[PDB]
Design a protein around this motif. Structure first.
Motif, PDB file in Angstrom:
ATOM      1  N   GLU A  66       0.855  -1.196   0.000  1.00  0.00           N
ATOM      2  CA  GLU A  66       0.000   0.000   0.000  1.00  0.00           C
ATOM      3  C   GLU A  66       0.883   1.235   0.000  1.00  0.00           C
ATOM      4  O   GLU A  66       1.868   1.303   0.787  1.00  0.00           O
ATOM      5  CB  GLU A  66      -0.848   0.022   1.262  1.00  0.00           C
TER       6      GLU A  66
ATOM      7  N   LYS B   3     -17.394  -3.564   0.083  1.00  0.00           N
ATOM      8  CA  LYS B   3     -16.815  -4.897   0.104  1.00  0.00           C
ATOM      9  C   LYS B   3     -17.505  -5.804   1.100  1.00  0.00           C
ATOM     10  O   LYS B   3     -17.888  -5.389   2.192  1.00  0.00           O
ATOM     11  CB  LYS B   3     -15.351  -4.863   0.451  1.00  0.00           C
ATOM     12  N   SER B   4     -17.651  -7.060   0.700  1.00  0.00           N
ATOM     13  CA  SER B   4     -18.245  -8.084   1.517  1.00  0.00           C
ATOM     14  C   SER B   4     -17.186  -8.832   2.322  1.00  0.00           C
ATOM     15  O   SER B   4     -16.006  -8.846   1.974  1.00  0.00           O
ATOM     16  CB  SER B   4     -18.976  -9.068   0.613  1.00  0.00           C
ATOM     17  N   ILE B   6     -15.387 -12.219   3.529  1.00  0.00           N
ATOM     18  CA  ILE B   6     -14.954 -13.400   2.827  1.00  0.00           C
ATOM     19  C   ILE B   6     -15.801 -14.579   3.278  1.00  0.00           C
ATOM     20  O   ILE B   6     -16.164 -14.689   4.450  1.00  0.00           O
ATOM     21  CB  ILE B   6     -13.462 -13.624   3.024  1.00  0.00           C
ATOM     22  N   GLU B  40      -5.735 -12.684  -0.932  1.00  0.00           N
ATOM     23  CA  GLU B  40      -5.398 -11.355  -0.485  1.00  0.00           C
ATOM     24  C   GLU B  40      -4.034 -11.306   0.222  1.00  0.00           C
ATOM     25  O   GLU B  40      -3.163 -10.539  -0.176  1.00  0.00           O
ATOM     26  CB  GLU B  40      -6.502 -10.847   0.424  1.00  0.00           C
ATOM     27  N   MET B  41      -3.863 -12.162   1.223  1.00  0.00           N
ATOM     28  CA  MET B  41      -2.647 -12.207   1.994  1.00  0.00           C
ATOM     29  C   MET B  41      -1.595 -13.047   1.330  1.00  0.00           C
ATOM     30  O   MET B  41      -0.402 -12.907   1.611  1.00  0.00           O
ATOM     31  CB  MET B  41      -2.979 -12.747   3.362  1.00  0.00           C
TER      32      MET B  41
ATOM     33  N   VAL C  37      -9.983  -1.021   2.785  1.00  0.00           N
ATOM     34  CA  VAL C  37     -10.200  -2.134   3.690  1.00  0.00           C
ATOM     35  C   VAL C  37      -9.827  -3.442   2.980  1.00  0.00           C
ATOM     36  O   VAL C  37     -10.166  -3.580   1.790  1.00  0.00           O
ATOM     37  CB  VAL C  37     -11.630  -2.195   4.281  1.00  0.00           C
ATOM     38  N   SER C  38      -9.284  -4.395   3.728  1.00  0.00           N
ATOM     39  CA  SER C  38      -8.919  -5.721   3.295  1.00  0.00           C
ATOM     40  C   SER C  38      -9.795  -6.708   4.060  1.00  0.00           C
ATOM     41  O   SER C  38      -9.511  -7.010   5.247  1.00  0.00           O
ATOM     42  CB  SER C  38      -7.483  -6.013   3.628  1.00  0.00           C
ATOM     43  N   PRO C  39     -10.862  -7.187   3.432  1.00  0.00           N
ATOM     44  CA  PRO C  39     -11.780  -8.081   4.155  1.00  0.00           C
ATOM     45  C   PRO C  39     -11.190  -9.400   4.601  1.00  0.00           C
ATOM     46  O   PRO C  39     -11.712 -10.045   5.565  1.00  0.00           O
ATOM     47  CB  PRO C  39     -12.902  -8.344   3.117  1.00  0.00           C
ATOM     48  N   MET C  41      -7.768 -10.217   5.558  1.00  0.00           N
ATOM     49  CA  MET C  41      -6.875 -10.123   6.675  1.00  0.00           C
ATOM     50  C   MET C  41      -7.506  -9.312   7.761  1.00  0.00           C
ATOM     51  O   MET C  41      -7.018  -9.403   8.911  1.00  0.00           O
ATOM     52  CB  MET C  41      -5.596  -9.512   6.191  1.00  0.00           C
ATOM     53  N   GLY C  42      -8.475  -8.452   7.437  1.00  0.00           N
ATOM     54  CA  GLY C  42      -8.992  -7.518   8.423  1.00  0.00           C
ATOM     55  C   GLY C  42      -8.150  -6.262   8.606  1.00  0.00           C
ATOM     56  O   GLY C  42      -8.222  -5.578   9.647  1.00  0.00           O
ATOM     57  N   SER C  43      -7.363  -5.883   7.608  1.00  0.00           N
ATOM     58  CA  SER C  43      -6.600  -4.674   7.706  1.00  0.00           C
ATOM     59  C   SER C  43      -7.351  -3.499   7.034  1.00  0.00           C
ATOM     60  O   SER C  43      -8.334  -3.713   6.320  1.00  0.00           O
ATOM     61  CB  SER C  43      -5.179  -4.898   7.192  1.00  0.00           C
ATOM     62  N   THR C  45      -6.885   1.154   6.256  1.00  0.00           N
ATOM     63  CA  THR C  45      -5.956   2.246   6.122  1.00  0.00           C
ATOM     64  C   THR C  45      -6.778   3.502   5.910  1.00  0.00           C
ATOM     65  O   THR C  45      -7.808   3.486   5.172  1.00  0.00           O
ATOM     66  CB  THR C  45      -5.092   2.005   4.892  1.00  0.00           C
ATOM     67  N   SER C 115      -2.140   2.657   8.858  1.00  0.00           N
ATOM     68  CA  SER C 115      -2.611   1.360   8.483  1.00  0.00           C
ATOM     69  C   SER C 115      -2.719   0.563   9.784  1.00  0.00           C
ATOM     70  O   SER C 115      -1.941   0.747  10.723  1.00  0.00           O
ATOM     71  CB  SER C 115      -1.662   0.733   7.475  1.00  0.00           C
ATOM     72  N   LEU C 117      -3.684  -3.461  11.281  1.00  0.00           N
ATOM     73  CA  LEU C 117      -3.974  -4.867  11.099  1.00  0.00           C
ATOM     74  C   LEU C 117      -4.895  -5.210  12.239  1.00  0.00           C
ATOM     75  O   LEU C 117      -4.535  -5.194  13.427  1.00  0.00           O
ATOM     76  CB  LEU C 117      -2.724  -5.754  11.091  1.00  0.00           C
ATOM     77  N   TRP C 135     -12.223  -3.209  10.325  1.00  0.00           N
ATOM     78  CA  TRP C 135     -12.404  -2.855   8.894  1.00  0.00           C
ATOM     79  C   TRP C 135     -13.827  -2.676   8.481  1.00  0.00           C
ATOM     80  O   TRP C 135     -14.119  -1.791   7.725  1.00  0.00           O
ATOM     81  CB  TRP C 135     -11.717  -3.880   7.945  1.00  0.00           C
TER      82      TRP C 135
ATOM     83  N   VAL D  62     -11.836 -11.743  14.774  1.00  0.00           N
ATOM     84  CA  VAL D  62     -11.437 -10.467  14.168  1.00  0.00           C
ATOM     85  C   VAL D  62     -10.482 -10.669  12.995  1.00  0.00           C
ATOM     86  O   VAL D  62     -10.312  -9.737  12.218  1.00  0.00           O
ATOM     87  CB  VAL D  62     -10.886  -9.482  15.205  1.00  0.00           C
ATOM     88  N   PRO D  64      -8.833 -14.103  10.188  1.00  0.00           N
ATOM     89  CA  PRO D  64      -9.022 -15.457   9.714  1.00  0.00           C
ATOM     90  C   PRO D  64      -8.490 -16.504  10.660  1.00  0.00           C
ATOM     91  O   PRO D  64      -7.482 -16.283  11.318  1.00  0.00           O
ATOM     92  CB  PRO D  64      -8.319 -15.452   8.345  1.00  0.00           C
ATOM     93  N   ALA D  97     -12.257 -13.663   8.510  1.00  0.00           N
ATOM     94  CA  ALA D  97     -12.370 -12.488   9.371  1.00  0.00           C
ATOM     95  C   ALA D  97     -13.843 -12.072   9.536  1.00  0.00           C
ATOM     96  O   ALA D  97     -14.633 -11.965   8.582  1.00  0.00           O
ATOM     97  CB  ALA D  97     -11.547 -11.298   8.828  1.00  0.00           C
ATOM     98  N   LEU D 117      -5.575 -15.801  13.461  1.00  0.00           N
ATOM     99  CA  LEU D 117      -4.922 -14.512  13.308  1.00  0.00           C
ATOM    100  C   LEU D 117      -5.703 -13.475  14.093  1.00  0.00           C
ATOM    101  O   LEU D 117      -6.885 -13.179  13.760  1.00  0.00           O
ATOM    102  CB  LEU D 117      -4.821 -14.117  11.868  1.00  0.00           C
TER     103      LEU D 117
END
Ligand SMILES: [Cl-]
Ligand SMILES: [Cl-]
Ligand SMILES: [Zn+2]
Ligand SMILES: [Zn+2]
Ligand SMILES: [Zn+2]
Ligand SMILES: [Zn+2]
Ligand SMILES: [Zn+2]
Ligand SMILES: [Zn+2]
Lengths: 144, 144, 144, 144
Positions: A66, B3-4, B6, B40-41, C37-39, C41-43, C45, C115, C117, C135, D62, D64, D97, D117
């Motif tokens: 990012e 966004k939804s 996962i 994603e990760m 948002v990153s669904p 990982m849950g991160s 920014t 950011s 996590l 997120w 919170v 995965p 998550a 995680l």
């Protein structure tokens, strides 16, 4: 063995000198400051000072990255005209795992902050790996 | 437009047949079941059926991995005698980011489950990268 | 099911309006832009615009967070005098998993990019949880 | 002065005794072996021995989680009949998550290995947080 929590960190960025970014992986006079490495996850964060005309060598992100382009203008994935993006300060980008960055370049003198989860795979035109460059490589190039 | 979350997944493991694990990166006729990939990760998870004498090609973990050896015995980072470890079922191992596994091998017929954050870089003896094998490579080898 | 790679994203930050940051979790007129948002990982920014005198409610980071203070001055973990840090633009910070932020505050009008996590646990004086905000919460407060 | 790589770990699992899992967050006399905690990312991994009828208190992931059910049967997100899943050994599950597990329970004596995680937020029926239980909480419950 009981494990302790990780120490917080602070860097006063204007009391850290820019260093030349390796010529093996860029052209045009790019400079950098490494800000952080996370040995456990393999993440790392840096800021770059990129002269107009500069670029990075072809590479692939193995994890998400990012960026916050604070100054200038950056063509990623070919630039907007070519179906990538042209970041224009102030710009934010999410470069997903597997993103291929053949020639990230800086039409205008630029500054950007970026965080990386995992290494960059620098590649030959045929996609074969040259070098896998991550937190440890970054720390050594910065500090050793 | 937002966004939804996962989707959750479930695999009935005994209703999945073992497939052969790529010969390019292993010896001895290792079989596997790919269980999950995270786009994603870049993490991925699989279970492996490893005949006596089998091995994986030299590689480096670019992120943390965790294994549960459910059957047999595995020598990692050279075996415990060499300053590495020799896992005996039931065994758990944490392989940290940047762990170098020149020849993870199986003195006895074995089975282990392992999750990987990020790719494995398979390397030549001089440390040059041959191939960076991550979630999408795993998916690709499993799918067809 | 074959999974595809995650789409890259770009946000032209000056074409996104600031929104007031929830009063439940801050005082003094803080505004924000959610950037990503990153669904999986849950991160997530975001960037914040924080008037002089402003602050965030007491909270704990459940995962690592990293900030770039681009303007102003921010006291974290009590400020330098109290054994935390006083970030002064340009400043970078790594706030580790479990970091406790009783009153992050802004002596000077400030702007910072961060950011995260995972979520923030907003806490009562005795440390009991009020709200776990991550997120999904961020995306809804921004966009719903 | 430069950061080191994280050490690899090995646990001989059959030389670790089962301990009781906290009653505050479970019913039925679940036992466990904590196998690993990661202070930096906040991940943690454990194996659980779950009697018939046992359950975990209502919670939200919170981040995965991934499980390998090695013995028995588990109803997650209400069981498959309710639109959830019913894991039968050998089963693998990906809990994404923000997954809400109001009553993960075991109709038969079971065992499962799972990596997390980040924390679990144990919640009241209205969704209010009771406790956020993460790596250091796990370590603390295991250690003494
Ligand atoms: Cl590295
Ligand atoms: Cl959330
Ligand atoms: Zn790139
Ligand atoms: Zn390995
Ligand atoms: Zn790949
Ligand atoms: Zn904070
Ligand atoms: Zn759960
Ligand atoms: Zn905690």
């Amino acid at each position: 063995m009981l494990k302790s929590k990780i120490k917080e960190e602070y860097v006063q960025m204007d009391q850290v000198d820019w260093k030349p970014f390796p010529a093996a992986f860029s052209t045009g006079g790019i400079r950098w400051k490494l800000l952080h490495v996370s040995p456990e996850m393999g993440s790392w964060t840096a800021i770059f000072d990129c002269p107009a005309g500069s670029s990075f060598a072809a590479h692939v992100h193995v994890g998400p990255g990012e960026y916050f382009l604070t100054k200038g203008k950056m063509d990623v994935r070919g630039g907007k005209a070519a179906g990538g993006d042209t970041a224009i300060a102030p710009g934010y980008g999410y470069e997903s795992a597997n993103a291929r960055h053949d020639k990230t370049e800086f039409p205008v003198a630029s500054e950007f902050y970026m965080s990386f989860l995992g290494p960059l795979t620098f590649v030959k035109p045929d996609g074969s790996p040259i070098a896998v460059i991550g937190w440890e490589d970054a720390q050594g190039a910065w500090a050793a």
